Design a protein around this nucleic acid. Structure first.
Length: 159
DNA sequence: CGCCGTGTCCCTCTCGCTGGCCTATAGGTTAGACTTTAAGTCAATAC
């Protein structure tokens, strides 16, 4: 499941290159602690393989998720609760879930709304963060690189 | 009704120098140009 040199996805930092694994015996138990490095924060995260999936670490998603997110980007007829607070909480929880589909839907909806009439700074921050993580994830999804990943995001949002 | 202990308040000189969250509504304000008017100006003239 976990192999050296694999570009594994760890939430909510997106891509996270593995380096190695260490015994790190604690309580007399050589609990395996595999080490990930994320290029965004330049931090190392050591996680246990036995419950690694419990935290939410996932491998690079294939092309099935790629076409899924494209189709979802072409999913119309979205309505939100009237109050701004409720919809903000909903999309923030959607981002926190780490599900690629949920964050993609949040990003697209917020971007279409912002481009519709322009909103605010907090929504802008949410959109920037979510778009950043999505572009990184897609870049590694097809190893298409961050710049070309941003451009493909920019063409596909056009529909 | 005295003596004692504790808490509180006021005082502690003069002069001088250098520098260190977000959204939606309704209402008031001003700026900007248009139109009017009192105002400043020039040219020729007569005594």
């Amino acid at each position: 499941i976990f192999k050296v040199g694999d570009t594994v996805v760890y939430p909510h930092h997106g891509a996270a290159l593995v380096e190695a694994i260490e015994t790190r015996t604690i309580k007399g138990e050589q609990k395996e602690y595999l080490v990930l490095k994320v290029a965004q924060g330049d931090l190392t995260v050591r996680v246990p393989a036995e419950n690694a999936e419990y935290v939410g670490v996932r491998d690079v998603v294939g092309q099935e998720g790629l076409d899924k997110v494209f189709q979802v980007l072409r999913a119309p007829h979205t309505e939100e609760p009237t109050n701004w607070s409720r919809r903000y909480k909903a999309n923030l929880e959607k981002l926190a879930s780490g599900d690629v589909n949920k964050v993609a839907e949040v990003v697209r909806d917020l971007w279409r709304r912002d481009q519709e009439r322009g909103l605010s700074a907090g929504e802008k921050r949410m959109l920037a963060k979510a778009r950043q993580i999505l572009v990184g994830e897609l870049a590694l999804a097809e190893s298409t690189d961050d710049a070309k990943a941003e451009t493909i995001l920019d063409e596909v949002l056009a529909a």
